[PDB]
């Protein structure tokens, strides 16, 4: 029994061990209560404004689109405190934890951005944070691991399974299944068991709300399409949510194509995986023929996740959103193009969204179209990844 629908059509649900059901029910009840509480809303808005720096800008990119009939805006989540959109929802989840009387936070992280976001929110709000991270990721993300430790979080390497993100997800749930009475699990994307896909959407939806107000102000009309990269789905559902009922506005999600879909080395389960049940949800995922959860792949560590949030699978199934993929090389070219023509260094994750907008423009340069790309993060973290490839070229 739940207060809210745990499914988006066939997708979603609460596929956790029975021991965790009361934790999910408690979290759902606290969320529903918080959403009706003007004091909670005011506290959350105050942190977003005065600590994180909302509203983020909406930047018109004129140099990129010169000579075409594309008008392109970037929603500047790269300017949010922490350098990515993740900060929005970790602030809201930290406030929910405190609402429930919890003093401890557990989080998973792959690339480390969610771990850093969780650590910063926990430092600000007086929570004791522990972060699980696959040992292979710990090795390759020293800068983020050091940030987490500077902010007072405990970073716990995970050596089981593939020692990457999915194994950290498992370990966070294993810990929670024994510690839920005192700890909140701060899940890092719009995935996992209900109520997380709903909570993360609602704590990211200011992205799209602001974009709508900003584009109305600047252009006097809604966008023809909003475009966002899809790792687990949080930044994309945050951009999309407020537009879902504006039926003229296209919603385009961009999964990582890695070395190419045909190589199998990609992270595009929504369009090229198979529905399964894992991490608490029924959703498309990267899996072997037998049903073992497979590793995904992208040049961008932040998009390298073997499933997708269930609301995206649902929006795809009904045709409300379209999903495409962008390869490593396409994302790299978009990264270089934004640096050189707009003076903005985008996250490699976000560069997937930008690359698809550039393709929309270049393929049909006399098509009149007003596009918004969600620039989910900044790309300082990526300059050496980009260096090391451009060096080998």
């Amino acid at each position: 029994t739940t207060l809210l629908n745990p499914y988006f059509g066939e997708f979603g649900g609460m596929y956790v061990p029975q021991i965790l059901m009361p934790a999910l029910n408690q979290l759902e009840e606290a969320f529903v209560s918080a959403q009706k509480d003007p004091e909670f809303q005011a506290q959350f808005a105050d942190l977003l404004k005065n600590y994180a720096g909302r509203p983020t800008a909406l930047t018109k990119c004129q140099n990129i689109t010169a000579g075409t009939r594309t008008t392109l805006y970037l929603k500047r989540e790269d300017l949010l405190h922490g350098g990515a959109h993740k900060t929005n929802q970790v602030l809201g989840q930290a406030l929910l934890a405190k609402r429930m009387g919890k003093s401890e936070i557990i989080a998973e992280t792959g690339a480390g951005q969610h771990g850093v976001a969780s650590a910063l929110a926990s430092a600000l709000l007086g929570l004791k944070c522990r972060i699980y991270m696959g040992a292979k990721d710990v090795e390759r993300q020293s800068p983020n691991v050091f940030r987490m430790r500077l902010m007072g979080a405990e970073v716990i390497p995970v050596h089981s399974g593939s020692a990457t993100l999915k194994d950290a997800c498992n370990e966070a749930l294993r810990d929670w299944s024994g510690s839920y009475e005192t700890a909140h699990y701060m899940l890092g994307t719009a995935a996992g068991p209900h109520p997380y896909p709903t909570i993360v959407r609602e704590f990211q939806r200011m992205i799209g709300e602001e974009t709508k107000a900003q584009i109305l102000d600047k252009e006097g009309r809604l966008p023809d399409a909003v475009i966002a990269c899809v790792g687990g789905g949080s930044n994309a559902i945050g951009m999309f949510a407020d537009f879902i009922n504006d039926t003229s506005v296209g919603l385009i999600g961009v999964e990582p194509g890695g070395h190419g879909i045909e190589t199998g080395e990609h992270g595009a389960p929504l369009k090229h995986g198979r529905v399964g049940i894992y991490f608490g949800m029924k959703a498309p995922m990267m899996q072997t023929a037998d049903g073992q959860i497979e590793e995904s792949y992208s040049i961008s560590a932040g998009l390298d996740f073997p499933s997708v949030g269930p609301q995206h699978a649902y929006l795809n199934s009904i045709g409300r959103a379209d999903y495409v993929s962008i390869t490593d090389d396409e994302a790299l070219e978009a990264f270089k193009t934004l640096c050189r023509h707009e003076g903005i260094i985008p996250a490699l994750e976000s560069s997937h969204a930008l690359a698809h907008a550039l393709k929309m423009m270049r393929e049909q340069p006399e098509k009149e179209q007003l596009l918004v790309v969600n620039l989910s993060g900044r790309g300082d973290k990526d300059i050496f990844t980009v260096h090391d490839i451009l060096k080998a070229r």
Binding site: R174, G178, D290
Partner: protein
Amino acid sequence: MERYENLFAQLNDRREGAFVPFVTLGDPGIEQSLKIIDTLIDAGADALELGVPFSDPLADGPTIQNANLRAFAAGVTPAQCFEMLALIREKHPTIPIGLLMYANLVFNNGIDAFYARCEQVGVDSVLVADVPVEESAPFRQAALRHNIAPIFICPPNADDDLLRQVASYGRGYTYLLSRSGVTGAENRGALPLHHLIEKLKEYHAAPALQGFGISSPEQVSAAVRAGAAGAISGSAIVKIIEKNLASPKQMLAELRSFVSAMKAASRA
């Protein structure tokens, strides 16, 4: 078949509890796992709980995580597990055989087809660790269509609605969790407890087996004295495998000694 019902009737006739080991199928390889399982039975196991290696066993602590990893190092697949199961049943016609599954392996190639394959090889029950009663409908319906008991879990803090649901929906045995958290011998649980055991009987639930953290004969004895029909032990068994990887004959001797002691504790 109803192998659990026959077992529990026989044990009741003897005022005896069940002792039920868990191991991972194919840990540390197929041939040694078959020998391990024969040893457990010869030493006095009343029933078996058998895991199919899965990439992401999120209800298992490190001991059983490592068992899954060893089976994968040996190339063990679900199809090989079903071959093993068919052979185990051909050797041992009455022992109840329960599988410990994760949902994706059941759902993968179709839920109905999974339970049909279980029926074909002679499995008696399936516990899907990451499907709570709230999500269980298609799993329990497919299990019952194929004469498989769907096993559900009663946590220590189970409220009345949940007890009612577990009692109504489950068959074969009711899993009584000793504590929150994940599998492991390093963490001893409760304190079954008695209230839950009594309410389950009031609601005509399948007989209770206590599991999680059961690693000593005294715990087996206590579980039965508390009114449970028996006890399950996994990590304590799997630790003997882990400790003796280099010494497969010693492994079998230590398993036999341990299981014999654990089973002795369940007798009246």
